Write a protein that binds this DNA or RNA. Structure first.
Lengths: 87, 102, 109, 50
RNA sequence: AUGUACAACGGGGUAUUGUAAGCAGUAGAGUAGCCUUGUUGUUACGAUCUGCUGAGAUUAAGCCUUUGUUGUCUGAUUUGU
RNA sequence: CAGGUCUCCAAGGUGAACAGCCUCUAGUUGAUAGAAUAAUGUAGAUAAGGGAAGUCGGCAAAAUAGAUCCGUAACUUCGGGA
RNA sequence: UGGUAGUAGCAAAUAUUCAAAUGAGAACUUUGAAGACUGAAGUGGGGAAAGGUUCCACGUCAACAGCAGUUGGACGUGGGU
RNA sequence: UUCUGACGUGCAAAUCGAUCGUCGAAUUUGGGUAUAGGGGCGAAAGACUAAUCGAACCAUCUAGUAGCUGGUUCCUGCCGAA
RNA sequence: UGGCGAGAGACCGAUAGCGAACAAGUACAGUGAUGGAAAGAUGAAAAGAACUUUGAAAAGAGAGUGAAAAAGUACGUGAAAU
């Protein structure tokens, strides 16, 4: 009775999509995510989750701005525009 | 051909369910062309798909038996399986005995 | 060489559908009439008829009649021919009581 | 389900537009190792879990 | 493989149940309808009963027997001191 | 995957009945088949005479059973027991 | 990757049959003719949860449907709320 | 409940069949919500807490430690135990 | 032992080296925290097989390209079990 006829009754969801991390770990009754910790203002990661940081650090996504930062350091944070020389 | 959709459409058009339509087996190539409901309404009108009228459930032996019960027959003790206050309750008979006198 | 012979028969199904399971009798009537027409006409491609199919299944699976009048026609085949050039075609005939009738060679005119 | 919010249907739209084989012209392209689509999600095999 | 052969039917015997379907009946508890209202007064309804009816049905699929009717009767394979 | 998962509609006959059994509207005819039908199984049966003598124990089956009428003891908390 | 072994087995839910069409090929597709079943606390009509395109059409038969396949909740392409 | 029937490399990591308890209330149940690990909850069986429970699952400390079990990769020669 | 930009090796060479030489924190499993793969090498170059025939088709047989198809897109050499 504790096996397949009680896996019959299993037709709800305890978790839904998290808005922040999008991973489907958002607990509905507690109203807090269990993977990223939304809506607490920090992102939960722990030093025993060595692989979890490897799944959620920088560089795993687009790097929509930092990709351009180091290059913009190399030129010395230029402002303005360049001129025309020849050819 | 493969006339699944034609039998479904014919049941939806005529209104009788799928167990009673009659796509005739001689004109099957014609019914291979009629793929829309507007063509099913052509093939119902001229007589290529018909309705196959209802199987008879004669309530005639029922009428003869109820007529015999009206005559007094068929009501012994071996046709009497419920209790005397379940066939006709005593409270019903009492209300009839006393809505009349009152 | 011609062999277009058409005959009639009584098939006795009680001596052939004896002791069979009830939910198998009418299909065994069918498989038995095909074996009958294989025995008599000699060809091995036998076609029954939906009239004959109704005549077996008048009484469900377990009510096939005792004697039937068959009419077996050994016609010649054509049109991308099968492995024999002749086939049987087995119709029923309408009679009141099938008991008492012998076999009859049907004349074609 | 049969009466939905919008966000789940938006992800179903993405899950529809991804449920297709390779374009036939990629297999001729220079330096190609992709021989099929290794992410075909069917509905009888893998539930996407929203 | 051309035979007082065999098979499919049909006939007869044997056997099992038990008197069919249909038609008829001064049989039928009674119930109405009528008229010359009767000394069986009839017509209709009426489970059942009687007569043809020890009838009908089945009978070999592991029963018997048969001069009747209709048919079938060489397809394939291997084998030697 | 012969399991599990909340609810609405609701036909005719027997029958007290939404029981079982048969049909109408509706839907299926899908669950590998063919031939034989040995042992031993699974599922259902039926048995002469005796009757639990079987067995740890009447375990398993059988028997009763619906309705109508009559009749209904000890004990009792006086309601029942039935 | 074996022997096991082409065996154990593919047996609950009373059940299939005939002819035609497509086709290289129909026990299983389609139509028709029968025969049955669920028998309205239904193997019927709608839904909630859940699934997410499975809905619907055209084409195809490699793989899957523990047999089959010209059929499909499959495959390919589109349409649809 | 019983058959201690079926099945027991199953239809099924607990179902199938007949029998049987109860069926109007300390009833059955959907959804929401509350209670969480040495804590929750318990008409109490140490039962239940997502096939896990005399103390859940996950990761880390962690390659825990073991006087205990298993294994320990080529040849020839010289000596050789307890 | 983080990020960026560099140089190197008495290191590993695809069951090794990071979990990841490839669409690798990917496919997938779990309610979740999390767990987490496998998978490189035709040829110099697609020249990746026109054409005829058998078959319904897959394919075969010839033919042909290629140094070589005992390299044919299930593609380098291609062992042992079997």
């Amino acid at each position: 009775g504790k096996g397949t006829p009680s896996f019959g009754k299993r037709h709800n969801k305890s978790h839904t999509l998290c808005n922040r991390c999008g991973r489907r770990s958002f607990h509905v009754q507690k109203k807090t995510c269990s993977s990223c910790g939304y809506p607490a203002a920090k992102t939960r990661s722990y030093n025993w989750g060595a692989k979890a940081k490897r799944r959620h650090t920088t560089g795993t996504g687009r790097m929509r701005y930092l990709k351009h930062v180091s290059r913009r350091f190399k030129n010395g944070f230029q402002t303005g525009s360049a001129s025309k020389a020849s050819a | 051909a493969n006339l699944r959709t034609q039998k479904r459409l014919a049941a939806s058009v005529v209104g009788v369910g799928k167990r009673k339509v009659w796509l005739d087996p001689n004109e099957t190539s014609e019914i291979a062309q009629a793929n829309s409901r507007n063509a099913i309404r052509k093939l119902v009108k001229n007589g290529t798909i018909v309705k196959k009228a209802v199987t008879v459930h004669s309530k005639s032996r029922t009428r003869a038996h109820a007529q015999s019960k009206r005559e007094g027959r068929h009501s012994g003790y071996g046709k009497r399986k419920g209790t005397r206050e379940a066939r006709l309750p005593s409270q019903v008979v009492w209300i009839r005995r006393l809505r009349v006198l009152r | 060489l011609k062999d277009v012979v058409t005959r009639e028969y009584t098939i006795n199904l009680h001596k052939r559908l004896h002791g069979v399971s009830f939910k198998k009798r009418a299909p065994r009537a069918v498989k038995e009439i095909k074996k009958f027409a294989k025995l008599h006409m000699g060809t091995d491609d036998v076609r029954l008829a939906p009239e004959l199919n109704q005549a077996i299944w008048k009484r469900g699976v377990k009510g096939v009649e005792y004697r039937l009048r068959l009419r077996i026609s050994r016609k010649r085949n054509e049109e991308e021919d099968a492995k024999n050039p002749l086939f049987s075609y087995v119709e029923p005939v309408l009679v009141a009581s099938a008991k008492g009738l012998q076999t009859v060679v049907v004349e074609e005119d | 389900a049969a009466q939905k919010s919008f966000r789940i249907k938006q992800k179903m739209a993405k899950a529809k537009k991804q449920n297709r084989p390779l374009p036939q012209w990629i297999r001729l392209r220079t330096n190609n190792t992709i021989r099929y689509n290794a992410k075909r999600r069917n509905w009888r095999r893998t539930k996407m879990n929203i």
